[PDB]
Write a protein that binds this ligand. Structure first.
Ligand SMILES: CN1CCC(n2nc(-c3ccc4cc[nH]c4c3)c3c(N)ncnc32)CC1
Lengths: 214, 203
C-alpha cells in the first residue's frame, strides 16, 4: 500500500467533489460574501468485534494528507500550478507520510440511501463486515467544514462477531483491529496520524459502552 | 447577529481561502490523482470558567453551513444567484474557540490565547494551556492539522459579531447529544473529554 512514486501536483479546473461557490448576504445590515464549497455529507462507523475484543478502523493513504505533510516539511511546494501541466513533487516524502488511521467512512452520494445503508455499505467494502441497518446506533451528527465546507457527518457504532467478518486471500485500504487494552494509549499517541473521529470514537466507546460488557 | 438577507449562491473564480489542487501519483504501481485544497492548520480552545461552572464556546453564523442546510432541505438549489429564504438561524453553529495558523511563526498556544482574547474576551497565558489532542481535519479534501487545547478560567480573566456561550455543566452532556444544535465534533469531543477527564477531579 505505502508505495507512492512520482507525486506531482496539478491545477484542478472541474471536479465533482470540488464545486466552490461564493455566498453573498447582508448580515446585520452589512453586505458580505464568503468562499466555500458544495461538498458531500458523509457517514462513519465504529465496529467492535466482541469475539476478538478489538475495535475496527481503516488505515489508508490519503493524498490530501500526504500533500499537507509535504507543505509543512517543504513550504511553498504547493505554489500555484502555472505551467503546461503538473509540477513534479521536488522533495517527495515517503508514502508513509499520507497514511492515516481513520474510522470506516464514506460519502453520502447514492440518491435515496438511508445513512445506515451507506454505513453497512462501507463496512462491507472497507472492512469486510456484514452489517444490517438495524444493528447500527447513532452516536453523533455534526459539521465538518464550517469554514470552507458546510458538510454534515453522521457517526454510527455497532458490535460485531467474527461471524460477520469474512475475507478471502486474493489491498488498497488496511483494516486495523485495535485491541481494547491498548486502545486508550493508542488514541493518545501523537505518532499516529488520526482523525478526531478516531480519538472521539475510542474515547466515547470506552466511557459509554465498554463498562457495560463482559 | 442571526439576521441574514438576500442569500444568493455564486460562482467562485479566485479566493484567499480556496486554492484547490490535483495530486498525481503512482500508488502500488497504479497511476491515480486526487482533488484537494491547500488549506491552513488551525487551533481550538476549551475554556472552563470555574467561577460560573460553565464551559466557553462560540456560536456564530457560518455561510458554508447555512448553504449546506439549504441543500439538504431543498436539494439541487446548488445547481450551477438563487434565494433560499431559510432563516439566518440555519447557518448558526456552536463551536470551540478557534483560529487559523497563518501568522508566520506563532507558537500554537499564542494563536490560541489570541482567539481566546478576540473571540471570548478572556485573557490567557500560553503556560495556562494544556494540549488535548492533535489530528487531521480534512482528510478528504483538505489534509490540515488541528491542535486542541484546554485551560481553566475565572471571571477574573473575562472582562473584554460572534456570540459567547457559557454552557452550564449540568446541561453540558445533554446539550452535546442534542442533534437540534449544529456543532463541530470538536464541541462534542470537548464536552465528552472534559466530563470524563477533568470534571471528576474537581469540587
Ligand atoms: C472508488 N473511488 C471513489 C471516488 C474516489 N475519490 N474519493 C474522493 C473523496 C473521498 C472522501 C471524501 C470526503 C470528502 N470529500 C471526499 C472525496 C475523491 C476526491 N476528492 N478526488 C478524486 N477521487 C476521489 C476514491 C475511489
Amino acid at each position: 500500500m505505502e508505495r507512492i512514486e512520482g507525486a506531482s501536483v496539478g491545477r484542478c479546473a472541474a471536479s465533482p467533489y470540488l464545486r466552490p461557490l461564493t455566498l453573498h448576504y447582508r448580515q446585520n445590515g452589512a453586505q458580505k460574501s464568503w468562499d466555500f464549497m458544495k461538498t458531500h455529507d458523509s457517514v462513519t462507523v465504529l465496529l467492535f468485534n466482541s469475539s476478538r475484543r478489538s475495535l475496527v478502523l481503516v488505515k489508508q493513504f490519503r493524498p490530501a494528507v500526504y500533500a499537507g505533510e509535504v507543505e509543512r516539511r517543504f513550504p511553498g511546494s504547493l505554489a500555484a500550478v502555472d505551467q503546461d501541466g503538473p509540477r513534479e513533487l521536488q522533495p517527495a516524502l515517503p508514502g508513509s507520510a499520507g497514511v492515516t488511521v481513520e474510522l470506516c467512512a464514506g460519502l453520502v452520494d447514492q440518491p435515496g440511501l438511508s445513512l445506515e445503508e451507506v454505513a453497512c455499505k462501507e463496512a462491507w467494502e472497507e472492512c469486510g463486515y456484514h452489517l444490517a441497518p438495524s444493528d447500527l446506533r447513532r452516536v453523533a451528527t455534526y459539521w465538518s467544514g464550517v469554514g470552507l465546507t458546510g458538510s454534515r457527518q453522521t457517526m454510527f457504532y455497532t458490535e460485531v462477531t467474527d461471524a460477520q467478518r469474512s475475507g478471502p486471500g486474493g489491498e488498497l485500504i488496511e483494516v486495523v483491529h485495535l485491541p481494547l487494552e491498548g486502545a486508550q494509549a493508542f488514541a493518545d499517541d501523537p505518532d499516529i496520524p488520526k482523525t478526531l473521529g478516531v480519538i472521539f470514537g475510542v474515547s466515547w466507546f470506552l466511557s459509554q459502552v465498554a463498562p457495560n460488557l463482559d
